[PDB]
Design a protein around this ligand. Structure first.
Ligand code: SF4
Ligand code: SF4
Ligand code: SF4
Lengths: 50, 33, 232, 49, 98, 122, 55, 232, 49, 33, 33, 232
């Protein structure tokens, strides 16, 4: 869905009864210089092994 | 035998002997150079 | 001490002794060749030296570097032989450079040689007086239009070996086809590409699971058909 | 004169892990003993390579 | 004149490189050797590496050979992920032994 | 007159140094025009194997007992390694890769993503 | 940390791919090279005839 | 095979050939010097040898160790030159001992030299008949009152290099000031000590974050300003 | 003739961990290419040392 | 030449050649001595 | 001195010198050969 | 610079100087032997050379390989001495081959030698003009029926040492019996096999916990009597 930038954004499930939401903001550095990008898209991002 | 010419020959023979000894020590017992 | 006869030990201590003749034998029978017998000299009658009834043909041959040392590298002797008339060359192109053959060296006092070697005979002739050493050919180090040099090694020479050797793999059998561990004795089934064949000279195993199934030998399969998923 | 090799490639199908492929030449194993080595295929991710 | 997706060459090359993503290991080696930022481009530099030899090498690596599973496959391919810092000779020797 | 060019039978015992007899060369100790002791590289280049003279025999990482029996290569990684003084990895085609974590923060997610309508409880 | 290992023992269940088969020479307490390890649901009833599920 | 002209190939196979002249060129222009052309010999008229219209001055010079081997260590030739009259000395104190310069070596058959070199001229004079090889100076191995020896190397020589080379650091920029990745083209701001300056010849970056902020170039900062806390 | 050096000291402020300090000499980098090394400073726990 | 001093000189030349070969093998290809 | 016999002696002295230098480099400073 | 007297420095620069004698001293007192003094020469009166009132006996002795280099291996000089009449042999079988002894080398200009050496006397005799070096015997490299060669080393020679050296063990004391850290000064209790003895010449700690309990010295036990269970 683009070269040089992407947005992804699978939506968040609606909460039931208020409550806070812990957020994990990471930034990962891979390779050097212009790279082609993901093989497919958002199916190429594995969070633990999925 | 003139020394100037023989010294280079001795040096080259020494280099060959050192290479042979190094390659020999990389065998099983040896010293692994 | 070496187990050598009392006659040789008696001769070793003499002040004036006979010449020590070294006889060589090249044994390529285990590598698909023949046996050749050589001596550096002829006898007094211009004939090949006869030892124990066997003729050792005259040929320029000389060995060096023979020693017995346990510490350090295993001893690697050298054997230089004449390559005039392209004789050793003929062996290099027929026996894969003679590699893997055996070299047997005998030291014999000339006083114990067979009586046929001497014009006046040998009263002290004794075919049981010899010192034998066996080595293997490791590499034909040089071969030219003049000579040929071979590197020899002790038959043990634990150089490239590893221990333990059997390796745990999936999708591949480590056994030897129709060997003891493989334990297969059926008819020709297929070749190494799994294509069916009734030709016994073209019957080989692909070493894959399908090759084993072709022979119904899956019980004796040398691989481990689950480890490919636990290693992730 | 090596006749058995263990090549370490990386499988992209099972999981991106080191798979060992054993290559042999059983004819030469009947002539020059059995000389085995290990080797790392630098860019390999296909069993064929 | 090289199409990485189909791994085909049109005709004579003449030079004049082009920025396209490819799995050709000859040109991965070329990038490793002549990149100024992270590679050996500051030292060495272009015109010191035979580009025609690498062209023929990449042509050889692009040839189709039996896959072993039933289909075909390019002869030699990349997909390395170099993370640790090794000496340049080590990486060059791995590239030239692959 | 000649070039000796020592081989292997000469160095392994002086059996064939006298085969060429090295007479006129030794009497002339050599020359400035031509050099002796060439030392042919036949058997020296082949010690590791014939395949070593055609390819550089790529290396492999040291075996570490930290891994039980897992084999690592020099051209992949599935870990999120530390990114301090560590060089940035190079990726050459395809591959499933780990990363060098640059930032990792844990905070409270703020409800509402885009647009206008935001509902907290349902 | 400071643990000392030897070349003639192992109390671990190591990975068993491309890792050769060990050799044990007398006695010793040993680990292993895991060949298969799967978790499933045990089926009630071991042998014989009578099986009782709830008691 | 090397791409050399047919005339040189024809000359190489002749039984009686001409003298093979070797002409040397030392190029220090890339390191802030000049180009010096040398030949071990004068010509028959007692003049520097004229090749392709360029005069190569007479000077005792001799190279050795030239070879093309791929396996093993990269070849390192050597070049010995005369240091009488302290000429090379003067080059060593002006060009940081010539380190980093280029050495170009041309092999030319004397039959193909320019006609000015010979009294009776040269009918077969051909300026396109030469074999060229380029090397780099690595170390002035010896410099004495008599001679001077330089080590040469291939221009590639992957000796001290590493790959990948770019390093991940905090509080320090790995870019080159006013370079490509730094991408700065503003006026003089400060020196390497962050002290403000309007002098262009004293304008350098401290490579810290403050130096980048001085130029409003924090977007192009070559460091990673969070990794110091994650590495604990 | 090295121009870039990575010195591994130990920071007592962030945490007692190995911090890398990059020392360069850009003038020499314009003359002798770029020769980079790594080095451990033995007793160093201060950036200045 | 007289044998003693010649043998000593050959020994020192051999030592120098061995040191040079060792330092040469520590380069890129080499054998790392 | 005849060359053919002297070359073997020089080679063997070179071998001995190489072995001695290797054993010397395995000391503290040295080079670890 | 070395701290040597002005007279020696004045002599060093002279065009025609006196002979430089080297006087050797072998000190085996720390290893249970005596002190011997040697010089390669007698004096003009056929007597051992008298220096500072001490007689150095004539004996063939010669040292080589003396140098001061900090980079690389620690310098290992050598000392060759005469083994005719088997004198050194006698020392080798009584002093464990002299290993561990001290060798002191003094360089003295013959002009400063004692006046008794010369028939006509010595006006410039000065017992304070000498250059002293100390080394240690590391190995008697060769001992034959003719000569004997000793390897020398600097007294520091951090060859086999490690740092830190004290090792954390259970069931064994690393201290030295009746040493400073052990701190035991009681009567004889037992031998190294824990068998009780009242013999002071047969009193040695077994270095186990029982041996320490025999002396009621468990407080000063050098081991750590819990680590054997936490290391599992
Ligand atoms: S795969 Fe089966 S048939 Fe083939 S060699 Fe192995 S055990 Fe024998
Ligand atoms: S800190 Fe900023 S201005 Fe300075 S060199 Fe780096 S990118 Fe350029
Ligand atoms: S065990 Fe006790 S008595 Fe024995 S040496 Fe150690 S501290 Fe001294």
């Amino acid at each position: 869905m683009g070269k040089g930038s992407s947005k992804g954004h699978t939506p968040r499930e609606a909460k039931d009864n208020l409550k806070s939401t812990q957020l994990l903001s990471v930034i990962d550095a891979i390779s050097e210089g212009p790279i082609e990008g993901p093989v497919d898209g958002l199916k190429s991002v594995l969070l633990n092994s999925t | 035998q003139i020394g100037p010419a023989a010294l280079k020959a001795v040096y080259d023979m020494a280099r060959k002997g050192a290479r042979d000894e190094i390659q020999t020590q990389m065998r099983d017992g040896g010293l692994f150079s | 001490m070496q187990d050598i006869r009392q006659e040789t030990l008696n001769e070793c201590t003499r002040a004036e002794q006979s010449a020590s003749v070294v006889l060589w034998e090249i044994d390529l029978t285990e590598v698909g060749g023949e046996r050749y017998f050589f001596c550096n000299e002829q006898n007094e009658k211009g004939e090949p030296v006869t030892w124990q009834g066997r003729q050792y043909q005259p040929y320029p041959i000389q060995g060096s570097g023979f020693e017995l040392n346990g510490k350090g590298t295993s001893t690697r002797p050298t054997l230089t032989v004449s390559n005039l008339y392209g004789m050793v060359t003929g062996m290099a192109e027929d026996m894969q450079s003679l590699v893997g053959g055996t070299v047997v060296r005998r030291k014999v006092y000339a006083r114990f040689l067979d009586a046929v070697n001497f014009v006046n005979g040998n009263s002290y002739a004794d075919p049981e007086q010899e010192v034998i050493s066996r080595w293997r050919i490791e590499q034909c180090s040089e071969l030219s239009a003049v000579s040929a040099s071979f590197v020899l090694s002790t038959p043990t020479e634990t150089d490239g070996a590893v221990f333990p050797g059997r390796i745990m793999l999936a999708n591949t059998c480590t056994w030897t086809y129709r060997g003891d561990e493989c334990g297969y004795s059926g008819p020709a089934v297929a070749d190494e590409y799994d294509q069916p064949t009734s030709d016994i000279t073209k019957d080989k195993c692909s070493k894959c699971l399908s090759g084993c199934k072709f022979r119904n030998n899956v019980g004796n399969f040398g691989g481990f058909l689950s480890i490919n998923k636990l290693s992730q | 004169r090596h006749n058995a090799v263990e090549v370490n490639w990386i499988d992209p199908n099972n999981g991106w892990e080191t798979a060992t492929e054993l290559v042999e030449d059983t004819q030469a194993i009947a002539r020059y003993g059995r000389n085995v080595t290990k080797m790392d295929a630098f860019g390999c991710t296909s069993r064929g390579q | 004149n090289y199409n990485p997706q189909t791994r085909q060459y049109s005709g004579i090359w003449d030079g004049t490189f082009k920025p396209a993503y490819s799995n050709n290991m000859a040109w991965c080696l070329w990038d490793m050797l002549t990149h100024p930022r992270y590679g050996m481009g500051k030292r060495l530099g272009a015109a010191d590496v035979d580009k025609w030899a690498l062209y023929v090498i990449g042509q050889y690596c692009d040839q189709s050979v039996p896959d072993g599973f039933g289909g075909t496959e390019p002869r030699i391919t990349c997909n390395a992920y170099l993370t640790t810092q090794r000496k340049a000779w080590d990486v060059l020797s791995d590239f030239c032994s692959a | 007159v000649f070039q000796i060019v020592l081989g292997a039978a000469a160095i392994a015992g002086s059996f064939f140094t006298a085969g060429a007899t090295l007479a006129a060369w030794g009497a002339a100790i050599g020359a400035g025009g031509m050099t002796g002791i060439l030392f042919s590289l036949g058997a020296s280049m082949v010690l590791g194997g014939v395949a070593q003279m055609l390819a550089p025999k790529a290396r492999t990482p040291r075996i570490q007992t930290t891994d039980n029996g897992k084999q690592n290569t020099y051209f992949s990684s599935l870990d999120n390694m530390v990114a301090q003084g560590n060089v940035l990895p190079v990726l050459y085609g395809e591959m499933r890769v780990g990363s060098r974590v640059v930032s990792q923060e844990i905070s409270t997610a703020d409800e509402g993503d885009g647009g206008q309508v935001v509902v907290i409880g349902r």
